[PDB]
Enzyme design. Structure first.
Site, short mmCIF file in Angstrom:
data_model
loop_
_atom_site.label_atom_id
_atom_site.label_comp_id
_atom_site.label_asym_id
_atom_site.label_seq_id
_atom_site.Cartn_x
_atom_site.Cartn_y
_atom_site.Cartn_z
CG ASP A 1 -1.53 1.37 1.56
OD1 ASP A 1 -1.68 2.23 0.65
OD2 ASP A 1 -1.91 1.58 2.75
CE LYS B 1 -2.08 7.20 -3.37
NZ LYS B 1 -2.34 6.11 -2.36
CD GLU C 1 -5.26 3.65 -2.05
OE1 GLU C 1 -6.05 4.41 -1.42
OE2 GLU C 1 -4.18 4.06 -2.55
CG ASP D 1 -9.25 4.72 2.99
OD1 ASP D 1 -8.62 5.24 3.95
OD2 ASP D 1 -8.65 4.16 2.04
N1 LIG Z 1 -4.44 4.14 16.58
C1 LIG Z 1 -4.65 5.27 15.85
N2 LIG Z 1 -5.55 6.20 16.23
C2 LIG Z 1 -5.77 7.34 15.53
N3 LIG Z 1 -5.15 7.62 14.38
C3 LIG Z 1 -4.24 6.74 13.91
C4 LIG Z 1 -3.94 5.50 14.59
N4 LIG Z 1 -3.00 4.85 13.86
C5 LIG Z 1 -2.72 5.61 12.79
N5 LIG Z 1 -3.46 6.74 12.84
C6 LIG Z 1 -3.45 7.82 11.85
O1 LIG Z 1 -3.66 7.24 10.57
C7 LIG Z 1 -3.14 8.15 9.60
C8 LIG Z 1 -2.45 7.30 8.57
O2 LIG Z 1 -3.45 6.51 7.95
P1 LIG Z 1 -2.94 5.34 7.00
O3 LIG Z 1 -4.20 4.67 6.51
O4 LIG Z 1 -1.89 4.55 7.70
O5 LIG Z 1 -2.16 6.10 5.82
P2 LIG Z 1 -2.71 6.70 4.40
O6 LIG Z 1 -3.90 7.49 4.79
O7 LIG Z 1 -1.50 7.49 4.03
O8 LIG Z 1 -2.98 5.47 3.53
C9 LIG Z 1 -2.14 9.05 10.31
O9 LIG Z 1 -2.76 10.33 10.42
C10 LIG Z 1 -2.05 8.39 11.67
O10 LIG Z 1 -1.74 9.30 12.72
K LIG Z 2 -1.55 3.68 3.88
MG LIG Z 3 -4.61 4.80 2.56
#
Ligand SMILES: Nc1ncnc2c1ncn2[C@@H]1O[C@H](COP(=O)(O)OP(=O)(O)O)[C@@H](O)[C@H]1O
Ligand SMILES: [K+]
Ligand SMILES: [Mg+2]
Length: 378
Positions: free
Chosen positions: A7, A68, A172, A196
């Site tokens: 991902d 991205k 995704e 998402d």
């Molecule tokens: N346990 C958690 N609680 C709240 N927010 C979280 C937690 N774990 C990750 N995040 C938040 O998730 C976001 C990243 O989301 P992710 O799905 O990993 O990446 P992307 O959105 O880049 O695909 C970041 O803002 C991170 O701080």
């Molecule tokens: K991600």
């Molecule tokens: Mg994502």
């Protein structure tokens, strides 16, 4: 040798591998199962991931992230021109293609967004090889459902630059549905809603799956709503608290703000499982330690408008798909920010108490499905 699923995220990326009959999501060298899509060029090295994002540099121009958002786009694209106004690094025009220009080891260098993304994919490949103990050359990489042909080709190009054979690019939300086995439905249409909420973007997708075949029926969302915005609200809250307690404004000290942002992101994550979080930073500003805390309730209050705003795109997606709520067969959570209890509560209430699929960590679900797809194609 196994193929991996990656991902490649706007803010965080994740890698998994199917072995021993199931997907193993792979932790990086700091033990984290996701890695920031973040690069920093320094006087002596190129940092990728946690080390880049948490670096406390005097000169902010030499880190790059959000690649991205540029990938597959032209320089004069109004989305590119708009985004440039909030990035610390320099975007330049080379033949109507955007490039990022930085200083690395004292020398000016420019990179296309595919090249920056290739560095993130290289790190993810390396995380996988460290875990497997052998080299990896094949991968499935995911992209948002709304990516066009040019953005898909650019992502494949980043894979090639990183030394991967890209077996397939998949959407995704399709990856998330595959992670949960929703591909195994049989004859008859099954409608899946993917919610998402990530670090930088919010996307709602409605998929129909029929005899193993996926069709995206509707997409909606907000490309500038995500966990980073919640972090920013916390940072601002604590900057105000520091001024209130110590009569000093720290907001213009880049190093202090960076250290606070790192501590705030950790505290936010903690508030998803605990009802309060400590924030403790030694010598935050002018030698002054900053020891404080915040409750889950207060965090929810700070972000209440943003959390509530996620429900409008769900209504839009349903309207576009011409589906009633009862016609949605499965609800799936994706994105790190859907781990926030208040966010789950709002969605659950909107769906009259129905169960959400969230047993795979939502920040890992995309990589999980990509890894299943990679195993299928090999
Ligand atoms: N346990 C958690 N609680 C709240 N927010 C979280 C937690 N774990 C990750 N995040 C938040 O998730 C976001 C990243 O989301 P992710 O799905 O990993 O990446 P992307 O959105 O880049 O695909 C970041 O803002 C991170 O701080
Ligand atoms: K991600
Ligand atoms: Mg994502």
């Amino acid at each position: 040798a196994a193929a991996i699923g990656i991902d490649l995220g706007t803010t965080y990326s994740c890698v998994g591998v199917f072995q021993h009959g199931k997907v193993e999501i792979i932790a990086n060298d700091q033990g984290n199962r996701t890695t920031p899509s973040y690069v920093a060029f320094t006087d002596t090295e190129r940092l990728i991931g946690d080390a880049a994002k948490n670096q406390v540099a005097l000169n902010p121009q030499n880190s790059v992230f959000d690649a991205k958002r540029l990938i597959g786009r032209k320089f004069g694209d109004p989305v590119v021109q708009s985004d440039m106004k909030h990035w610390p690094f320099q975007v330049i025009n080379d033949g109507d293609k955007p490039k990022v220009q930085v200083s690395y080891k004292g020398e000016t260098k420019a990179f296309y967004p595919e090249e920056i993304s290739s560095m993130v994919l290289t790190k993810m490949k390396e995380i996988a090889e460290a875990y497997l103990g052998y080299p990896v050359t094949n991968a499935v990489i995911t992209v948002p459902a709304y990516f066009n042909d040019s953005q898909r080709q650019a992502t494949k190009d980043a894979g090639v630059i990183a030394g991967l054979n890209v077996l397939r690019i998949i959407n995704e939300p399709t990856a998330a549905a595959i992670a949960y086995g929703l591909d195994r439905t049989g004859k008859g249409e099954r409608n899946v809603l993917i919610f998402d909420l990530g670090g930088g973007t919010f996307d709602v997708s409605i998929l129909t799956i029929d005899d193993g075949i996926f069709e995206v029926k509707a997409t909606a969302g907000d490309t500038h709503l995500g966990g980073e915005d919640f972090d920013n609200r916390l940072v601002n809250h604590f900057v105000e608290e520091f001024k209130r307690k110590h009569k000093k404004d720290i907001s213009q000290n880049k190093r202090a703000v960076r250290r606070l942002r790192t501590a705030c992101e950790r505290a936010k994550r903690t508030l998803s499982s605990s009802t309060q979080a400590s924030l403790e930073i030694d010598s935050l500003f002018e030698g002054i330690d900053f020891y404080t805390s915040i409750t889950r309730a207060r965090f929810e209050e700070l972000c209440s408008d943003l959390f509530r705003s996620t429900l409008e795109p769900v209504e839009k997606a349903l309207r576009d798909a011409k589906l009633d709520k009862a016609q949605i067969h499965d609800l799936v959570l994706v994105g790190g920010s859907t781990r926030i209890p208040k966010v789950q509560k709002l969605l659950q209430d909107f769906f009259n108490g129905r169960d959400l699929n969230k047993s795979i960590n939502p920040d890992e679900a995309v990589a999980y499905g990509a890894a299943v797809q990679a195993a299928i194609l090999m």
